[PDB]
């Protein structure tokens, strides 16, 4: 699940005699595989237009890879989610190197802070923020400062053995 891929799914109503060549609606879906991608596509087309899987067709599904996977970006993410007593819209910022990884982090973060499962979340929009001074969240802005450098105090080293003879230290 969290090993997310991004798919474009393009579908349409089933062609008839009155309206051949329907309008080829397309979405970008974050999903673990194509089966889930197609299901999410039909769920959203179901909710937005008067169409369903039985009366429709999937013309194309394509994985969309990151253009520059090794370029650290800042992502604005607009989501809509269901809490225990209502529905809410949220905006969040993720510093990450790809859209699928940023969406992974978003789902982990929504699960952690709002106990919102994948079931309850609609990804409205994921967009790279083109430049700084547009980053609105301090938890992301604090990593954009010039010559940023920080230590990692209290390093804990994993032991391969039950017993140690040396009283380990945490220097780093």
């Amino acid at each position: 699940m969290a090993h997310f891929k991004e798919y474009q799914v393009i579908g349409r109503r089933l062609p008839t005699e009155s309206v051949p060549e329907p309008k080829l609606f397309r979405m970008r879906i974050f999903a673990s595989n194509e089966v889930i991608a197609k299901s999410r596509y039909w769920y959203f087309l179901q909710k937005l237009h008067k169409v369903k899987k039985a009366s429709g067709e999937i013309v194309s599904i394509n994985q969309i890879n990151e253009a520059h996977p090794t370029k650290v970006k800042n992502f604005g993410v607009w989501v809509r989610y269901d809490s225990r007593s209502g529905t809410h819209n949220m905006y969040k910022e993720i510093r990450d190197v790809s859209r699928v990884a940023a969406v992974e982090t978003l789902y982990q973060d929504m699960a952690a802070r709002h106990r919102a499962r994948f079931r309850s979340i609609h990804i409205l929009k994921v967009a790279e923020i083109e430049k700084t001074a547009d980053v609105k969240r301090q938890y992301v802005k604090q990593f954009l400062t010039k010559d940023l450098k920080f230590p990692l105090p209290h390093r804990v080293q994993k032991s391969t053995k039950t017993f140690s003879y040396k009283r380990p230290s945490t220097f780093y």
Partner: protein
């Protein structure tokens, strides 16, 4: 008359910091931090040693005391050029940390005959060491 405060130096998570990967497909190679993603993730690059440019968790690597000048977000070619210019490889090889690692593989690669020769040489060295330890 002079205020004295213990420094408590730490290796800093910073661009140009050399890290030693300890788990993964690299698992024992040097890489450079090219850009910081967050408190737990950084983007690293190991072009000379064959470490692909990748976002990694800081728990997968150990910071070394080695640093070199590197602009933030430098691409693979310039990382390689500045790594070679700074001569990171032999500055790493000269440290006793790398010497200890090399000693560990050399010991692991020994044969039974070589281990017997090690025993014989150790006894020969021990004879002279004990002799001098008794003299002085």
């Amino acid at each position: 008359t002079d205020s004295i405060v213990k420094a408590s130096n730490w290796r800093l998570v910073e661009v140009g910091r050399v890290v030693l990967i300890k788990k993964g497909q690299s698992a024992g190679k040097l890489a450079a931090i090219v850009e910081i993603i967050d408190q737990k993730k950084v983007l690293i690059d190991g072009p000379k040693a064959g470490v692909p440019r990748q976002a990694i968790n800081l728990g997968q690597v150990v910071l070394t005391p080695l640093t070199f000048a590197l602009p933030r977000g430098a691409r693979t070619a310039t990382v390689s050029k500045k790594w070679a210019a700074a001569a990171v490889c032999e500055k790493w090889a000269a440290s006793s940390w790398a010497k200890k690692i090399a000693q560990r593989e050399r010991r692991a690669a020994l044969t039974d005959f070589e281990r017997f020769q090690v025993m014989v040489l150790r006894k020969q060295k021990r004879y002279t060491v004990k002799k001098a330890l008794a003299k002085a």
